[model samples]
Target: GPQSEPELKLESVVIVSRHGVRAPTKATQLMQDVTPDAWPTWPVKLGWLTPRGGELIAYLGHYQRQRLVADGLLAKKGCPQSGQVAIIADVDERTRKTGEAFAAGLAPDCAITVHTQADTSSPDPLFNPLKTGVCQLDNANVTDAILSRAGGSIADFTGHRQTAFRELERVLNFPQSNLCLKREKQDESCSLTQALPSELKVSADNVSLTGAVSLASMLTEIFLLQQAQGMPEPGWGRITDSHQWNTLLSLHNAQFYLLQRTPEVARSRATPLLDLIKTALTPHPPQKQAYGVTLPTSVLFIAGHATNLANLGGALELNWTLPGQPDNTPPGGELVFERWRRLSDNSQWIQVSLVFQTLQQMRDKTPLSLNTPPGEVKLTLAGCEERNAQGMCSLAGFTQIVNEARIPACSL
Candidate 1:
């Protein structure tokens, strides 16, 4: 007789991440003049979490750990009034809130400790790594490095270029956009434009470099977290309970099945490509180097920007699956895993099946597709967001390539 192998489990988790930086809107004169149309709204108006975003993070933690508890991975910890779970958050309002929300979901007993770079006496510490506190802080050199590695000409900028541009532009009162356009045209030998100063050109180069480095550092961090750790012992000092692991496995299998049936659904924008990376890293029993330490067990529940989730390799759930089921006996909800990206939230989340779809489905219902491999796909949970009177919960907007043949079939 053929026997099934034991599934790998998750343990402690460490996620160095960015907050949901959103598009900014101006209601007044001064705000509109200074803000660029392309600048995204900051997630927080004044560096505070959006109520809806906070709720979403809280729910994600609750749902994930609930599944874990059902799988015997964690005990029912209950929700926190603060609406957080047990997790230590690095300083940064968004990060702190995320930790609080997740901890509240895991259990009331969950503890959250917050830390920040400012706490350390030295601006840079050897034992502690730089935190993703603000968008541009500590990112000067990193931004430049990423772009350099991405490849550019010798005249390109170093990490400090953007800062220099600010100072120079301020002093000269030059139209930055006009200057850039003029420089670009000149680079192509257009006779109409005047040449820029050597210093300005150098500053531009630096800005480009710094921007690249910043983006690259972020990407690098994502890659590192997704990769399985090589620690000799249980990476996070905890093993995922069999039940929780089973839920994830079941979700994985279901997704695989969905992809196998509707090849086109795989093309939808809701599927998170990053989930695949996390899926691959799940460690089977006896593998000590599984999830990192700091967790009570290897069972982990993460909540963040939807794009990050997809980039990490999450599979999308097929639309044809039962969107939601009525609550019945213990664990009565249908368990389905769908891939999705939320363009509005500018983030992605995995829709788990204790029951049905979550809130925030795109009202348009336009068929989502991606030209790129590992693209995103939307998954809607019926009545998932009824609390908002929207009656929709969807994850959409990330992209990645995944195979259609490997997923499991949807069962009632």
Candidate 2:
């Protein structure tokens, strides 16, 4: 068992990642409601993954493999076995293709299959339990939870966001848009800066928002996509500077916090995935029974949406501030859980890290390698406070925290 005394060896890993960049999911006509500015056409379909996005994911995959091998998790010079790496992808065009691209980068010669629904058009309960009816949420509780998080009224939160709203309107030129067409003649300005305040939109299937805050959240995401896609003069060049990005992106993060990241909503939708993680990441065997340097699965990759990341972060009371990335859950961002075992005593730790491409990396499609890896930040979970100097918690501590935080009834 003498690998190294002080160092910890990587035991296994689980990466729950958002799909890579795509054209904004909304149609151009729907986006036109936000502004009269001509929506630039995309190289791909409205919601499909762009070719560059796949390439970025592949680069990440390559980097991850190299890191794993260096840490002595996977063999450095062979195709991983079928069960050594398991990839579960949601059925959206963006996610499934992202899984395939990752597989190629992980092992270009291996016949690795990215598991998904056969139809590829159907939703998977593993990724979207609430929408698939695998688990049902009490709409009343959801509304209450969201409102409570918003401090009684969503408008109260958005009211203070006028600066961001004013900046957005400058980009959107809202005075000429469809939302402004019905403005009363007496109104001083038909702009988000003076538009209707935010209101919750609790539909039969999902919870979202309507009004100025909602519109701004939508618009900011579209602007992010445009910049990510390397378009010229994104937001008509009015986004101006890096200093302005955080203020604008905070609105997008706020929307996720209200609608998706609420505890009630996250537990209802993400419990199955939590169960999978708990089951798959079994505690390491005692020091005596530690046979070799391998586990049944070296990597468990779940390719999904930013919503999944939000729900997961909320459920575990995890928080991180990524440098160079304005949006907290940017495209291809991931929650990387690494199981590390101390060589001396076989003691284990769960090292939680936020893995993502920085804004500059995404915009430039930077090639990542061992020496120049992507952005990574260690996260501290409120549930697991006893961390080592490196910010990793005991495996027992992590398991117990997740066990207590999880809602068993939500499991599929």
Candidate 3:
């Protein structure tokens, strides 16, 4: 990557974001069974983004607005006219509120209302086509994919992370928990690190790695979430530092990498949103609509989830490693897609990046302005290898890669 130049003209930008930090979503009995202490309570309801989370996202929005303004993707003067800014979110409260919070920062004077899908317990097809029954996967293919990535079996996968499982056990004080006592009564060892037999679960709408890795993934993510939300005494105080955090998070990363980032599975899940991004980035005039977009939208923001980000990364064969952040897709994190045109030739290019705040920033309630921006890491599409000196892939290359990666049967 080389230095910036003034010859590039900013065009439309699309942001697919993981909603801000939220509660554990649920305190399943299994979470307690593996531990001695009750999980810490959050300021918001289960799965809802906390007020602190909102402020953090708002700060992110502020920084983003400044960046876009500098690049001319957003108008610097007055309020945005109709069709200039577009914001959308999934039906979940966290996603909806995240979009609303970001809107406030992006346009404090405008006070825009973000577009939201109709509320229902049913999943949003745009984000989870498989769960919404809009797409299907062969159970055998899904299982084989999961197994192949898991070193041929779930047991081997768990074995690969025995150190992490043991660390989790130590933190939970597993031997002192009721689970161990009850299992001892049956003469069966009940250690969480034992790596029990599990299988791949397939349903009408979803595929899950059921068992130790699955459960550990959830628990490890909970610990990280608790820390991100600034909850007290995360992981019972045993997770003392970043090294431990990374080691514990390895399990979660592995789980998601298999379930959501596997190419075979990710192509099926991410096609809908990926397709939306393609439309949003393509040149068009301001006109009629899609789900929540006005054509030729200058800013298209979708407050989604970590799984969505992971799936997209998988589908594109792209990966990122962030310093000081173990979880690749943290709360309030975003995948920003920027379209840049060379002014002289009027040829469009695409720059993709992962943007977010670190745990320290969120905990301190950092105020992000132009000078003090959030963390950013540029990402490279696997197939779009011929990037310019600025590391931006040609728009044609990006589009071709996306089309090649999309699953035909998974269309909306």
Candidate 4:
């Protein structure tokens, strides 16, 4: 048999950023009744950043710079002069501002252009405004400028609500009013999933809230192609490829669900779930066109809470496939992190990062028999919890945990 040339692989990374902290998560109506004004600032609700969140973003920018430099992806001559970092926020203001703040820290001289729809209408504040403020650089200045030019209101952020609606139209390929962010019975055009701000509010009708996760995952692909691969120009390679994007989304959805169902001890935790993602491509590899059945790399990353650091024995454990396909349609791997014993003055949130690599069919000048379909990759992370239970058992009972449980998002 003739020998096959070694495939050129590309190194890629996906960076996921959780919205900065908002009001407390347990803002009940009853609690609101007792403290009206304070209820508005209840640490969990009202989508905005807190002062602490601003500080965190600044730190993230620093860390991001270091990471890019360590990876040797940043350009010394660019205006931002570190790495070519692109910031895309959710339609929400907090997310927009958070991205801006982080970007500012990453590149103080560069300006952040508003690409999110929610930024136009200035969607209602749902999370903590304090943290939101921390990240807010221009006071929605960037957003206001864009809307103003379009004959829209800097006063009415909802003017852009239709933009979000437009996204479903384009991305989901749905019809007019096909996806409303509301919970109802017998409404075909509306999907409760659309209304859900966070994945915590799951219902019979709402199955996937891929907005947050999908956006993050898409960004990952872009970063991998442009930054990791040393692509001189800025572009959306992975996102531009529909077939590739769909495949990535499906895999991410599966893996996210799997994690939701399986909980690792906080003590054993390491990188945030965002860093755990990996692709079959190498830092720099030859491009091939083996669409469906080619054995690409399988990537994984697990985010950990600050508490989990103690149990890692001083480091985190990350798992992945060996550049080949797993026989199982849905593959599984181990997750490790740390847990907290008690709250501390500085222990407000956990620190998470991700590290992942893909598997290939051929390695070390040899080929393996692991011939699996490209679409056969199955990775799942369980959803966020829906129950009101507390304690370790509470986590056990909840098969999934969406960002809504941790932060403020839409609801049913």
Candidate 5:
């Protein structure tokens, strides 16, 4: 006779997410100085969340709500119970707006608090750990590692680094009729030749390729924004070739992976975030309020940049080969950590998973189902092996690993 194992009940969940797509941060200035091509204009301020981005994030929120309901962690219909959920976002407007969009989908009529720093001009250390001044790891090793993984010396794989700038020159119709060339002749503030490998060094803070990597990255964003706006393709044309686009995208991914995955960088940058998640998972005494609402427990939601996910993934030693790019963290993607309790054993466990709905899926507002689930990859922490049937570690074991991963300077 076949027998089924007892079901595990969901307890709490923690999600760290990248903000949705937006216009280029330097769209206006770049368009004016560098390119002759007519770039599409966005309704909102540059780099702010667009309508398309908001809609897609809302859909993600809705999908998550559906899953929670099915797991019996939340009701099928009604506002979330007070203290059931908390949303915290980086100080950037795009991040805050993304959180708001998700909350709108998760609880339409229910009010949810979104926390941010008081000063908008300065970055909050909680969300920007690199600014803490204690996470200074050697940059040369990180650079060498990245270059080696991409295939030995920089010139070996990428050929001439100047080729990237030349490609952009062609795309932008530069020398024919552009102000950049004139500025370059005069030794002005702007130069088409800037952002070269020597200028844009590969370090803990900067991850730029010698050739067309920076150009490719910027062009990718421009194309995505144009597509989202339903505008005409900009520059040379839409980058329809899959391989070409992937190569460019991979260059971008390499920067993050190299900068954040090392032990020195990961421990210092990700430990604070790990601490926040640990606090949320622990059973706390009754408080007057949580996330500005009263509840017995709460699920933690954090919204930030793609780098946050990269650093966290590196800290946990997770790796992936995505469809188009290796070790890529797509926009609007999330790293989810779920806590569950076994009814039979009455033991707590934690599962870590990365979930991302692709650009096409979000564009179509595709409904997530068993037949067509989001791109999900389960992750296992390094140096630990006490996983349950569901690929989760015991809460006690996970806490110990977290403590060990903390940086010495930050431990104080």
Candidate 6:
């Protein structure tokens, strides 16, 4: 019953996606300091997307193309007509590349332009809220409120800070026997003492942490990347257990939730994106202007990071309980927004849903299933009527909420 298609006529769709897997963005010195030996080298420069990531994203694009065709959103075969599709991505190499790869799979042999900011090195405020002059919240106030919610410190999360640090140390083999710690005015020490801090402070542009969980999360990614690329596992045989890996992952998830999920941060960071989605769903001209570009009638693809999804979910006051985790955004995950028109009454509506199409096991490169299918968690907007069995809100109600949620001035 849940798999049944909606009776309404599908109008348009928008997909906001996180970039696929990649090498660490952090510097090499920090990574070397924590590992027992030299870190594994990657084919591309640090933070760039890998071939595996491109391939996986292309597969996801193919899936989307199939679904759209089945829904009569596109022709069964041929290039997309002009203005039928639009793809935009953050200026980062990883995101741009992922967008290109997805576009290739979505329409092979079709020339598609993936739009980005003029300067690749500079951050686009629409995609990266941390960039200068973008965030509107007062840093100190936001940080204090976040810390207060976490019981005065980040260490208060589940009372597992110490265990999480231990796992990090074990996984990374922190402080090799020959390593020494040097302080500016103190004598050089030879032992590791709390590689990560128990608490963090948030700023308009940054979040300060002990570096333990961040390190752990980076190491886990490295390990998975190695497995995917047929490279040998680093750290010898340690850090192979799945439960331990999940623990490290959870720590990273907790950190993001703390920093980005706050109402002020989430709403401000996600406003630009939400505005884009609203434009794509609007049926008329003036309401369809988005970022100085006209909205497309077929589909819109926006490629971004995990934080974008997290912030968008928070801004919309949406909740999700996905399999294996509490709905943290996964790599290559997607949040899809669809517009529909009732066949009987000719009334328009909107539906938002999340789907994490990912490997059954990260290490094996196994194909994610479509038979059983990852659960599509339908989302609801606050102050709106309860969504029907098909999880949709009337267009009028959705538009009202969108207008209320939009930020003042603050052009993207």
Cα lDDT, all candidates: 0.30, 0.80, 0.83, 0.30, 0.67, 0.69
Give the per-residue lDDT of model 2 (tens digit) for 300-401.
788999999988888888888889998999989989988888777888888888999888888888888899899999888777867876788888898888
107-217, model 4: which lDDT tens digit per residue? 566773424434446532222122233122232433333344324532232232344333323433223222332225355554312442323222221112234333323
Decreasing lDDT order of the candidates: 3, 2, 6, 5, 4, 1
Displacement of the residue 99 alpha carbon in candidate 3, Å: 0.5
Per-candidate clash tally: 106, 0, 0, 95, 1, 2
**Candidate achieving the largest lDDT:** 3
Model 2, CA-based lDDT: 0.80
Report the C-alpha lDDT of model 1 over 1-412, residue by residue, as the tens digit. 8754423222223232323221222334322232222222333464455544444444445555655554444555443323122233334465556656555544545464343335533322111111111111123333343334323322343222434333222322234334344455444532111222111111211122122222222222221111111122111222233332222223222222222222222222222222322342232242222122222223333323322222122233323322211111001012223222334443334343322211111111111112211112234432232211222233222122223322222100
Which pairs clash inside model 2? Answer: none
Measured against the true structure, the TM-scores of the candidates, in listed sequence, are 0.34, 0.91, 0.94, 0.31, 0.80, 0.85
Order of the predicted models by TM-score, top scorer first = 3, 2, 6, 5, 1, 4
Q: Give the range where candidate 4 is weakest over 10 consecutive residues by summed lDDT.
A: 361-370
Give stretches of model 1 more than 4 Å off: 1-5, 9-17, 20-44, 76-86, 108-148, 154-412
lDDT of 3 by residue, 95-171 (tens): 99999899888888686767766664667788878876787877777778778988998778887777888887887
Of the two candidates 1 and 5, the one with more favorable TM-score, higher being better, is 5
Q: Which of candidates 1 and 6 is the stronger one according to lDDT?
A: 6
Candidate 2 lDDT trough over 10 residues, lowest sum: 286-295
* Model 5 C-alpha lDDT per residue in residues 176-234, reported as the tens digit of each score: 43565555465454334453332236454434554345544556556544544445454
